[PDB]
Amino acid sequence: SIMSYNGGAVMAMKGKNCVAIAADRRFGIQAQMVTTDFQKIFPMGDRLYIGLAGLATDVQTVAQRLKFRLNLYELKEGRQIKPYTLMSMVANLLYEKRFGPYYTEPVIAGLDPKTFKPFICSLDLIGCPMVTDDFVVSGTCAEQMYGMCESLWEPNMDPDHLFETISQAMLNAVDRDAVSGMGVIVHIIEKDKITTRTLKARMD
Amino acid sequence: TGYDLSASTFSPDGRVFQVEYAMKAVENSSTAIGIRCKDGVVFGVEKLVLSKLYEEGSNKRLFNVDRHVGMAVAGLLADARSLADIAREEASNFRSNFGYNIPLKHLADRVAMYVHAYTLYSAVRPFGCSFMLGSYSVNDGAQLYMIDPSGVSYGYWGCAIGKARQAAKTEIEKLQMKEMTCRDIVKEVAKIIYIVHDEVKDKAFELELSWVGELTNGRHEIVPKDIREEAEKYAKESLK
Amino acid sequence: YDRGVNTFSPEGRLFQVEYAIEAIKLGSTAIGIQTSEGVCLAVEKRITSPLMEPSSIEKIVEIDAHIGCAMSGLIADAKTLIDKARVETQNHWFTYNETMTVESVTQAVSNLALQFGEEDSRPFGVALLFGGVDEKGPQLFHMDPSGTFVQCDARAIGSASEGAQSSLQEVYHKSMTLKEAIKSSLIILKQVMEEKLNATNIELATVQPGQNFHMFTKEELEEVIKDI
Amino acid sequence: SRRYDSRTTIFSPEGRLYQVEYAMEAIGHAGTCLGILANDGVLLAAERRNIHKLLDEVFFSEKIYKLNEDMACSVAGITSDANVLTNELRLIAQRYLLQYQEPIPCEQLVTALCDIKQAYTQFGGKRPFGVSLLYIGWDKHYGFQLYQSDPSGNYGGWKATCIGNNSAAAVSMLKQDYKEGEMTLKSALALAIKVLNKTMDVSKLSAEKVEIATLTRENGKTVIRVLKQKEVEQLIKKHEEEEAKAEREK
Amino acid sequence: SYDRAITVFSPDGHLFQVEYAQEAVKKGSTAVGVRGRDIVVLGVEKKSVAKLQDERTVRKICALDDNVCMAFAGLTADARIVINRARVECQSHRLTVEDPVTVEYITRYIASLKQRYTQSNGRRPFGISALIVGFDFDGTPRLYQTDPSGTYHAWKANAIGRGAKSVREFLEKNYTDEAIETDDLTIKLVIKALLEVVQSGGKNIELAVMRRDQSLKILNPEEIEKYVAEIEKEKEENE
Amino acid sequence: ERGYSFSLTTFSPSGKLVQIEYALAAVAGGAPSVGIKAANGVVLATEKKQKSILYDERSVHKVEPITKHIGLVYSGMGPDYRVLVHRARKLAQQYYLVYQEPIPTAQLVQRVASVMQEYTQSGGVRPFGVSLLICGWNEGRPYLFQSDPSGAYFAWKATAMGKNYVNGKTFLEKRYNEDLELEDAIHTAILTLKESFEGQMTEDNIEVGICNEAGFRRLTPTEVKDYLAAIA
Amino acid sequence: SSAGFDRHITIFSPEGRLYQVEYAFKAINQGGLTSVAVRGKDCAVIVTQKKVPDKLLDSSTVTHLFKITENIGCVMTGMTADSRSQVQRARYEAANWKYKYGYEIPVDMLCKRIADISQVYTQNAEMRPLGCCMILIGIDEEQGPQVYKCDPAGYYCGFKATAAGVKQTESTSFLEKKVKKKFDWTFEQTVETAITCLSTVLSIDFKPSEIEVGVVTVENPKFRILTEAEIDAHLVALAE
Amino acid sequence: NQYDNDVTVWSPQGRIHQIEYAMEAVKQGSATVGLKSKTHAVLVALKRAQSELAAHQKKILHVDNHIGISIAGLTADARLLCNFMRQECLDSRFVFDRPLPVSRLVSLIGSKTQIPTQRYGRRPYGVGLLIAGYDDMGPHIFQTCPSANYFDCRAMSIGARSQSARTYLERHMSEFMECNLNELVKHGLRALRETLPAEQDLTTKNVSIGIVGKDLEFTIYDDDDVSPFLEGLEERPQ
């Protein structure tokens, strides 16, 4: 697909009091990879990231446009943004190109700014949001990560088993995948700190 | 004094002097009357030859807007030409958009709103025109309207626009208007125009008579006044 | 502000056009003469400083290969007129493979000599002498800010143009020659100027039907001056 | 229509400019601000207009406007007239960042705002922005900086700035007590405390009448410290102990 | 837009704004400039700093291309607009025809812009007067000046700002083709002209040059001090 | 129209804007009002005396909600008041379109004051002789924002605008304090409004709106006559 | 207190006034016209005289009662042009309401829109502020009949005993002395009080050919203009 | 006199003075005379010069194959309305493929000049038109005015000292209808030799004559085909 023009896979997963987001490192054209350090996970303020997958043009574009609007909002109001507001903003920004659409599947993961309430959601390429409580996936490979997360997820998870669960899920579902691989980056965050680990993925 | 400049301002007592000045501009223009019979409306304009240089039949103030409507203007002539072009355009729109003849009430109201729009702002001046609107329709009868420079448009049986505004309508109202067909009203208007101002201020004038009604089958045109020649043989019998 | 841009007179013509005709007068003088042999043309630069480099001051500019010009008073408005007239002559050549003749040039200029309008800007402040060689031989044309364009046999513009026109009417006739007209013109120049006449004051511009290119004389002007 | 035109841009009957001088005199009757010479760090001082007891003070900023993440500005003059400029200014900085993804080097920012002001000086014939306003900030090409916008559109990089009739004598104190080399923020705070102690008519300088914000470079960040009240209170007590030290000469 | 002309003619044939707004240039900072045979020299006066503050942003001499140099007078803001406009223009000339920009082209642009800016509907004309120095065609040294009307006008030396009559009257004695035409003596004698300012503090002097193949170099007040010292030495030698 | 597009408001030699000062005077010549921010809610109260006994009190309503949780009163001229009310309505609903969340009162005052500031500067139009008193209970803490014709704004613990507003203000400073309840705020608001109004004050002379954390509420003359029947 | 050009355009004066609009509040008074509205119970009554001294002038097309919509009528005073322009704008916004919102417009919203348009004219300068006053009447469900008034200033209000024109300080004095006794208004009461209050103001006690009576009732919500015969019936019914 | 400023302002006596000023400015052009037969419409103008050496400012200018106009007043507005005139001719020439009747063209001209006399920000046109043409009902001599109150006549005369010429037109308007072109043209310059002071005579180079006929295309003449027209005269009765 045109979504499979540059590969890509973003997994988010809600734990007990914490949220884990991961993506793949590979970038390249249809059969030819180029680099192993492409960025798809972006920090939008504190304890709140976003992931973008699909066409890398729209990835970097919408990342910059959302950063533009986010810094405008965060300077117009002294508080930091709430995740539902970010979801609505992404929905509006995608829906403005109702017929000129960006080819991306944004995934938002952030905690509550006031409490330690987690939040995950995902959208369509036209702006259909969807909040769940277990996991949201995007990118080219879907059914792989669906089967793995419906196989491995438990509701109430400490960050350690959360990390291991999302690690095994991403690794196996990527190793089965063809156009998306070449290293995995993992962001496992909580109220207290931000952890970023990288896995020894199969480079095949 | 000072307030009278712009056309958007009011006075310390509450009126607009621009519109008043425009109203009394028409007062020095030629006298133009109009009266309806029971199956038509008759126009008539006292028209004057300057000295010897005209052609008896140029610049006719009896216009003809629609197939059944014409104007009888007095005041500034070129302003009247512009106004008649607006009316021609509006009747053309209505004919295009509904497929039949414009009723006189709606036409006069569109014209009145156009005149009002030229009275509102300071960008334009008010008009120096006062005109008649005549009609005939088989489902409507005879209708005669009247539009001032300000934009107040309503109906009459008879009217007069010019110097002898009062001095004509003094004896217009003694005419048995309902019981007469227009073929009498022709020589009636003839004797009215001939009575007012024979030789006193000026030397010579000239008569035009427009003519709409049932006798024309809903057409509107000037009479062949030369046919039946009704003024002069009655005019010489009207000095006694 | 004292009856400005768009108002007639109780007796006569417009205010600001009359003020433009007044504003011509402060400019530096110039004299063109039409001879059937060719049009000659002269101007005075009115140079003030020794720093003021003479050959950078333009008065005679070059419209086409066979059409000269001369100006008065203001400067850059005339430069804009020259620019647009050049563009329009080139458009005429582009769609006609020929030369826009001198009258058609001047009509294309005077079509917006008066298109001054601030609503729906100011009138231009320059009087222009045009010289060219059409198919009917040589031509000499004089226009004004008011657009009232006429053909002149030998027009004198600008400052001190009264005595210039008078003493020019003293010597002129129809069957003049070229060099006689040139020296007769520069006589009037050094009679109306205030400085001594030398190599840097004036400049001549002569167009011939056989000498279409180079409507100019450069430092043979010194030889021309010393013959008086 | 043409007897309702004001002057709106035109030169004098004598050679000068009308709205520009009147904009300067509109500046003069406003709050007082200043900035100091600090090699590391830079600070702002501000005076509270409307210090009446029935306000809320929940905005945490009355003159300061944290405009980028590494720049704020004080301001002096007509308030929402300046708020329009703050909105447009943050917009210009943020679209710079959109175009490059590198923060704004602040002088072309200042020229952008000055060109906005100048475009209403020459044509446009509207009421000009009668607001002068400061600039603090940091970059990659010069470090810590200070700037002074004017309604003319002329902008001056100072090291110790100037506001009007309330602060002309402040600039006199700045020249008579010029410092160089000491980047110490605290000596600069004592200096600014002394300056506003002379210039403001607030007797004995209660901290409710003043407002100070700084901008220091912390390890990759350039944080903007809109500092709280208690340290201002002990700064005032420090300065009046220094007044006791001054009257040790009696 | 504003349907109102600022540029109506006088009763006697003048403009109440153009020759009048030249007086703003007359009430401005002074700046001179000459062209030598290889090196061009110009500079502004009246730094007038608070002796505690910065001046690297108040620089009134700038460049548009690597080959051309600027100056102005009057008020600085209009000069800023004209400078940024002209930078965009000369770089867009580079986008066209691939020469270095001639000085005559860019002065025609500046004067034409100022003129059509005076011609338009209700716009305050630029109260500046620039000095445009460059040597492009085989390094031929030129300098042009502007006018608030927009009449570019090529000179060999120039004097604007406050008391330019006195400066050109110093130039009256300083017009010699000899002038002994070293680069140092040309610079120092332009510095003597700028030191014929009405105050002549000696340290308010801001001068910069161009060697017709290099770029802009800003000087240092120790060579300027040596130039002032040797000027005083020549003034002692004349006695 | 022609689009003449110049502003009538230019600077004095004193540096003032005399049209804006005249507009503020025209505000001050308007109907009184009082607005008090208590510890849990905010109380708005106006003073509405009909010119005759012929007028009805069921058609025109001074106290006006902008959202379901943001009240808004004024002291000035209703024909300008309704305009900027409608503008604020459309503006708030555009915010709720974009963000899908109720707009905070600070954001309202930013945007409305920017629009009003724009009318102060743009071509030929007069400024709006209206002094708002905006309030709402956004995120627990309630707020109270006064604006003005100059485009500026503030934040008051309690204030007053209209006839003898300085006298009402001086009574407020002595009577009102920092911490009360909504009922005590209503009590002192009716006290300070009845300090300055005419003698005949009924359930229809005043119009009171409160601001719970449960939302904006517009009280009825039923509970007004429950309360204002000789509240002290 | 004439500072600046406060006698000419819409700017603020010293001390808080602006004279152009409070010159327009006597722009109604050049009409020479008087209008009275009454709402006591589930009917609503308009009454307004004509002033026709002419026999040449009609009587049908001189009425100021203007059917805006099928359930909404109105009456106008002031000058005619502003009145009729306001009438077309009211009809146009009513049809726009019916197109956008699917149901019949209430008289409250319509008067609010008219007042907003009045502000729009008031806001810019170089625009004439339309010196006419508009009273509207209609029936609304769950509220009964309604009476509204629209100022030139854009200040609308809705109230029971209603009168604007020339002589209405006296009319409102009569209506304060009248609407205070707590009688019900059983529609002959309304018509009788309207005609008799206009009779106490003008003191003419005249034919049924001068006043036009506009009524609407909660039995037939259609707007209704009364006929000569029933006006005569009510007139002789109050003749004792 | 303070109401005597602009086009928009009415007078408190109703006479808008800008149009009167435009009329008086039209009066200070060159003299001109236009008169028609039953078959031939002849218009005759007079040229002046700026000085001795210069050529004469031309007045009779071409429009179309059957239309030629005289002019008095300003020349810029003249050439502007000339451009519009040629445009309106060639437009109907394109669409309907017929020449225009004259009266509807002059209606278009009056409607054109209506707008700048009506709004604010334009001036009336200083203009002196004498239009001669051919519809199916023969020659027509129309004139305009800056007030656009265009007239049809049988012989007009507008410009400087044109009133004595109108007296000549009065005393020979009986004669005009019958004759052929030769004595018609010499009646025309038997008006123009009374448009001049009596101490000088009408020469060749100052006069110009434009004839259109029912079979004749409109043609302009100057001094060479006017030397036949200038003979056939006697002196004035001094």
Author numbering:
A (entry chain p): 2 to 205
B (entry chain m), G (entry chain g): 5 to 244
C (entry chain k): 8 to 127, 134 to 241
D (entry chain i): 2 to 251
E (entry chain j): 2 to 240
F (entry chain h): 3 to 234
H (entry chain l): 4 to 241
Q: What did the published study say regarding this structure?
A:
A set of ubiquitylation pathways conjugate ubiquitin moieties on target proteins, which are then recognized and degraded by the 2.5-MDa 26S proteasome holoenzyme. The proteasome is composed of a 28-subunit barrel-shaped core particle (CP) and two 19-subunit regulatory particles (RP)5–8 capped at both sides of the CP. Substrate entry into this chamber for degradation is controlled by the axial channel in the center of a heptameric α-ring, also called the CP gate, positioned on each side of the CP. The globular domains of a substrate are mechanically unfolded by a heterohexameric ring-like subcomplex in the base consisting of six distinct subunits, Rpt1−6, which belong to the ATPases-associated-with-diverse-cellular-activities (AAA) family.
To improve the resolution of the CP structure in the open-gate conformation, we combined the datasets of SD1, SD2, SD3, and another SD-like open-gate class and performed a high-resolution refinement focusing on the CP component, by applying a local mask that retains the CP structure. In the CP of the three SD states, we observed asymmetrical gate opening. While the α-ring in contact with the RP in the SD states was open in the center, the other α-ring in the opposite side of CP remained mostly closed at the same level of the density contour. In the current study, the 3.5-Å map of the CP in the combined SD state was substantially improved and thus allowed near-atomic model fitting of the C-terminal tails of the Rpt subunits. Thus, our structural data suggest that insertion of five Rpt C-tails into the α-pockets stabilizes the open-gate state of the CP.
